[PDB]
Amino acid sequence: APSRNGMILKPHFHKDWQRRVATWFNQPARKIRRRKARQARARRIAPRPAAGP
């Protein structure tokens, strides 16, 4: 039931989307994991540049 004035909206929530919900609480922990593996790789190739070829 639309109101007086507004948009026509198509919310893509007719599937069982609540089961497939990806939270992002790993993001602060992921950044540490990316940094620690990057720092560990650099010490393995200590004379070579960290970026690579």
Binding site: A1, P2, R4, I8
Partner: protein, 147 residues
Amino acid sequence: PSRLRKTRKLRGHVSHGHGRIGKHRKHPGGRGNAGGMHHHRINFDKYHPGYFGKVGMRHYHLKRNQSFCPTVNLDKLWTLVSEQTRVNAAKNKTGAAPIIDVVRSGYYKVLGKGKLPKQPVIVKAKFFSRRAEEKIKGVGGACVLVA
């Protein structure tokens, strides 16, 4: 802030702001945009004209990269180069017109919307409008095509 919401003032009221005759049922009018050719006809015509039907040609594999042709008006033409170049252009007695490369700043077409100050320019752009050219020639400038 749930303390600032309406439900804190609705405690003790039987119908909770939804009326006693027309109770707050589940879906009285149907889910979503139901009834376009039906009981919601007036709202779909008085507020969304042109919703129902097809018009135009279909285009199967459209790439938005091909249609990228950003435009810039003659208002913000001198804003592309720094203000120092504008002062020295009118200061110079030889008449050396500075070059403003439109593609360098990230635009391809030049439109003749605005007024141009009376000092010559050299405009390098991927495309030009008809009125944009005459305004540049009216000051004594040149339009240079570049790809």
